[PDB]
């Protein structure tokens, strides 16, 4: 805290509570007693624990019928209208599309749909798998994911 | 029916203005004006000006007839104080409070 280190008043003689610093945390405009520092909150996940959680999440999605497997999931043009029509056809609103390798058309089309995400098979995460109501994986994505989780 | 007049931030202590305002309560405005005329108080001057303003508001905005008009309500609230410094002996400093008051007079035909 900005300020000087002078004793605000002398130690004895004044009928005042003994003070030593204008920057005391008891004082208004003084320091914070345990002031925050910028800290790193990320914790460690064992590789096996992370992979076991992914396997458990995928098993749960299959049991809950939230996982939809398909072949090709593409759109002929980078058109949000096209992807929205395709999802409305497939009866999908909140969906996480996991493709073999990222298609530029599909990525550009999905970028403006906020209930729609498009990951690469390598870029799936537990929070997304749980957070989206439907997870549409292609067959190539399923193969890559089982290889990654074996 | 009821007519209010206020002197807000009246430069006087609420205690003294209340001394004066206790004299005219539930009294006809004529008697109240006589009492405030012959009360020897700065607060009496203030309260008389407020009561006259009330009578005038009643006879200009709410109707007429000063005669059928009593001081139904009169109260003195405290207002903001003005803080001043007064030097005392041996370097000490006191704080004077210039106290003010809101004088409110409600007259009415009842």
């Amino acid at each position: 805290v900005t300020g000087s280190g002078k004793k605000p008043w002398r130690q004895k003689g004044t009928g005042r509570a003994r003070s030593g610093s204008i920057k005391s945390p008891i004082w208004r405009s003084g320091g914070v007693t345990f002031a925050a520092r910028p800290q790193d909150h990320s914790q460690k996940v064992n590789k096996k624990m992370y992979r076991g959680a992914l396997k458990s999440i995928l098993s749960e999605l299959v049991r809950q019928d939230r996982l939809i497997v398909v072949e090709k999931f593409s759109v002929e043009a980078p058109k949000t209208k096209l992807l929205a029509q395709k999802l409305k056809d497939m009866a999908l609103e909140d969906v996480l599309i996991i493709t073999g390798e990222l298609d530029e058309n599909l990525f550009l089309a999905a970028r403006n749909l906020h209930k729609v995400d498009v990951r690469d098979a390598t870029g799936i995460d537990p929070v997304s798998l749980i957070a989206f109501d439907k997870v549409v994986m292609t067959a190539d994505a399923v193969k890559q994911v089982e290889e990654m989780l074996a | 029916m009821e007519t209010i007049a206020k002197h807000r931030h009246a430069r006087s202590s609420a205690q003294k203005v209340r001394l004066v305002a206790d004299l005219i309560r539930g009294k006809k405005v004529s008697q109240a004006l006589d009492i405030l005329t012959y009360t020897n108080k700065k607060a009496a001057v203030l309260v008389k000006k407020v009561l006259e303003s009330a009578i005038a508001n009643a006879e200009h905005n709410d109707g007429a007839d000063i005669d059928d008009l009593k001081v139904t309500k009169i109260f003195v609230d405290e207002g903001p104080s003005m803080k001043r410094i007064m030097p005392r002996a041996k370097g000490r400093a006191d704080r004077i409070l210039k106290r003010t008051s809101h004088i409110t007079v409600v007259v009415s035909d009842r």
Binding site: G13 | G91, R92
Partner: peptide, 14 residues
């Protein structure tokens, strides 16, 4: 304030 006078000396209980 900024100036606090020294209190008067106590009675010398000696």
């Amino acid at each position: 304030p900024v100036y606090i006078p020294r209190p008067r000396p106590p009675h010398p209980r000696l």
